[PDB]
Design a protein around this ligand. Structure first.
Ligand code: HEC
Ligand code: HEC
Length: 648
């Protein structure tokens, strides 16, 4: 009789299927693509999927196929995934922030007078980044990076110089996808790097603030569209989506700002933490709200499109590179747990995971219960091969580990600010009717509208009319931003490693997810020592800072206090928020491109840095409540479930 545990180095199903197989081998089925209407052939099964995959390559009628085919063989996929990884390491997609020489001297902006000899480490510490596992070069003053293979300086993982769309080293530094999407757990002596472990430590606001005070890349230029944060390990990255229609023609990606499609009063979505790329292969949808099909890469393209230096053709023309990025992400598997596991305890956990009804014996009466068996599995997915072969649990064994449930907010009840991001029909319609929704697949679509500002102004008006309930103007595409209803229950493969948890990174360990009463409202992880100069302590990421029992960061609880003399200053209310917490780069970028009053990024002070280094659940969007149906568990059930998660 099949195993309960399923520990695997190779998790990604295409990589499982291609392992040791020649290039010409027909690619394995992507199980995410099986999650379509009809999948739930047993309506009484423990798990009922509700977030369906949408195939944009061969779209439902009346849409037409206009995308190059996805890979059809193991060799095609592997070559694509290699190109994806090279793109992540060397291509400058994300908006450049600073000249290489300004970055070389950025200790000036930290308040140092001369370069400390630990400069390269202090960069990592200050900004919550890591020593990169690849050569990540930038040119020292005087060096021409196109004669010196990028330069002899090295950047941390998370920053990039890279190569522009003409294949040349740019001489400019910005963030990379890895600033948010990647991190090290364990020093490089303790652990190899694996892609797709979301960053718990990055401070996006502090990098933006520092960079803003360097020599402008463009002398008179506008503020840059770049993300901010209230602290570390989450950011307003997703705020970009709301910003997009303010700056860019939504059909052509021409930079042509307009008032007509920007809802300037959509509520701020809060901070979100990056989901884990290394389980992309199990997720039918993108984004914390499950809003888009995982077949789509236009969402993955946002930061490359939002770069102010590209023209409409170049922005749209990033698509091939992003399909290769996407294939690298689907090729990923999570790191395997590096410590000891009690196999028998993990098997008790496996059972609890798949079978224990959290609403059993009248528990959690006040939390609406979804269709299914009330177990972890009824939302997150079925992991156990034994349960995967049982139609009381899963209708198809190929669906093992698939996360395709968006849990309604009335049940999940975690911080709701993020689920309001595209709540307004007007916003979704702007998206639905253009390039973002792949409206080139409409049967009514001819060609891209003209790439010119006058014509872009012409089209804005009937677009806004459609957005507000009027006649169709631009055709609709199949890559619809779904109306939000809740949050995706994400894959727990790899979750051992990815603390802190929930979409806002508010809960520092798995125990806390499992026991709401033990979640600290404010919590501080172990820091590194300050560097030479006495500043830039960072978050320590060595194994000693991780909690191998409760599965998460070691932390010290801290009390909120509105007294101004306290340090770190950690208010009990979002109302006492300081200027660095309230700032929105996206808001001011929009204001400035729309010829409205705008506020430039505040210089973030060292006292504010002290507060950004502690997680505060009281800030807007930062609540640590929710997923409370785990309170019905016993502590014995919780330890078993933790041991089981170690095996995922
Ligand atoms: C922080 C400033 C980020 C940078 C730079 C990039 N990404 Fe990101 N990404 C980020 C967050 C917080 C989220 C979740 C947003 C939300 O609230 O829903 C994402 C989401 C993705 C995803 C989908 C992941 C999933 O749902 O499993 C992908 C595939 C992704 N981002 C890709 C990506 C690429 C390719 C980037 C560089 C061009 C990139 N992102 C930059 C945070 C940030
Ligand atoms: C549906 C009703 C669910 C049940 C039952 C369980 N989980 Fe859950 N989980 C769910 C959602 C929708 C989310 C995302 C919440 C958010 O806003 O972020 C979660 C989150 C977790 C997490 C954190 C995952 C991450 O941060 O990437 C863990 C570790 C987790 N869930 C584990 C878990 C276990 C062990 C359960 C059975 C006891 C369990 N969950 C039940 C949806 C639901």
């Amino acid at each position: 009789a099949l195993p309960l545990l399923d520990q695997a180095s190779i998790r990604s199903p295409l990589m499982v299927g291609c392992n040791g197989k020649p290039d010409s081998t027909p690619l394995p089925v992507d199980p995410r693509s099986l999650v379509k209407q009809g999948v739930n052939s047993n309506p009484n099964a423990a798990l009922q999927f509700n977030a369906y995959f949408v195939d944009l390559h061969n779209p439902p009628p009346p849409f037409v196929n206009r995308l190059p085919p996805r890979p059809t063989t193991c060799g095609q996929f592997r070559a694509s995934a290699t190109r994806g990884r090279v793109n992540l390491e060397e291509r400058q997609f994300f908006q450049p922030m600073a000249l290489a020489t300004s970055y070389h001297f950025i200790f000036l902006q930290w308040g140092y007078l001369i370069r400390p000899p630990d400069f390269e480490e202090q960069v990592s510490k200050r900004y919550g980044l890591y020593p990169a596992p690849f050569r990540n070069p930038y040119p020292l003053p005087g060096e021409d990076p196109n004669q010196t293979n990028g330069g002899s300086g090295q950047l941390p993982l998370g920053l990039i110089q890279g190569k522009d769309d003409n294949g040349r080293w740019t001489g400019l530094i910005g963030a990379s996808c890895s600033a948010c999407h990647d991190s090290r757990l364990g020093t490089a002596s303790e652990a190899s790097f694996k892609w797709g472990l979301p960053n718990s430590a990055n401070d996006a606001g502090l990098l933006a603030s520092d960079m803003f005070r360097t020599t402008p890349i463009t002398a008179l230029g506008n503020l840059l569209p770049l993300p901010w944060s209230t602290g570390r390990g989450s950011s307003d990255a997703i705020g970009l989506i709301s910003l997009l229609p303010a700056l860019f023609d939504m059909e052509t990606l021409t930079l042509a700002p307009s008032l007509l499609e920007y809802v300037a009063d959509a509520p701020h979505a809060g901070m979100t933490k990056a989901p884990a790329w290394w389980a992309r292969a199990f997720k039918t949808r993108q984004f914390w709200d499950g809003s888009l099909s995982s077949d789509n890469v236009h969402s993955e393209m946002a930061f490359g499109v939002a770069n102010i230096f590209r023209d409409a053709n170049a922005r749209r023309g990033l698509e091939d590179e992003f399909e290769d990025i996407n294939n690298f992400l689907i090729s990923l598997s999570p790191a395997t747990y590096p410590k000891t596991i009690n196999t028998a305890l993990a098997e008790q956990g496996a059972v609890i995971y798949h079978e224990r009804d959290l609403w059993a014996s009248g528990a959690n009466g006040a939390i609406p219960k979804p269709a299914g068996n009330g177990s972890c599995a009824s939302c997150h997915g079925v992991y156990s091969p034994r349960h995967a072969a049982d139609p009381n649990y899963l209708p198809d064994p190929r669906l093992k580990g698939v996360a395709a449930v968006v849990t309604p907010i009335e049940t999940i009840r975690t911080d709701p600010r993020r689920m309001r991001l595209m709540a307004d029909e007007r916003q979704r319609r702007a998206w639905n009717s253009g390039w973002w929704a792949y409206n080139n697949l409409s049967p009514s679509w001819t060609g891209y509208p003209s790439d010119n500002i006058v014509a872009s102004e012409l089209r804005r008006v009937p677009r806004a009319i459609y957005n507000n309930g009027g006649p169709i103007y631009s055709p609709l595409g199949p890559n619809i931003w779904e109306e939000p209803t809740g949050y995706i229950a994400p894959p727990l493969y790899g979750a051992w490693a990815t603390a802190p948890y929930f979409h806002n990174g508010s809960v520092p360990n798995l125990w806390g997810v499992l026991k709401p009463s033990d979640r600290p409202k404010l919590w501080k992880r172990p820091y590194t020592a300050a560097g030479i100069g006495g500043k830039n302590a960072g978050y320590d990421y060595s194994f000693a800072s991780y909690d191998w029992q409760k599965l998460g960061w070691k932390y010290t609880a801290v009390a909120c206090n509105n007294s101004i003399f306290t340090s770190p200053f950690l208010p009990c209310t979002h109302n006492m928020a300081t200027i660095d917490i309230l700032y929105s780069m996206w808001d001011n970028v929009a204001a400035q491109y729309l010829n409205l009053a705008y506020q430039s990024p505040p210089p973030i002070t060292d006292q504010q840095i002290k507060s950004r280094m502690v997680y505060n659940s009281y800030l807007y969007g930062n609540d640590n409540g929710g997923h409370d149906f785990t309170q019905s568990l016993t502590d014995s059930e919780r330890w078993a479930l933790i041991e089981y998660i170690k095996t995922l």
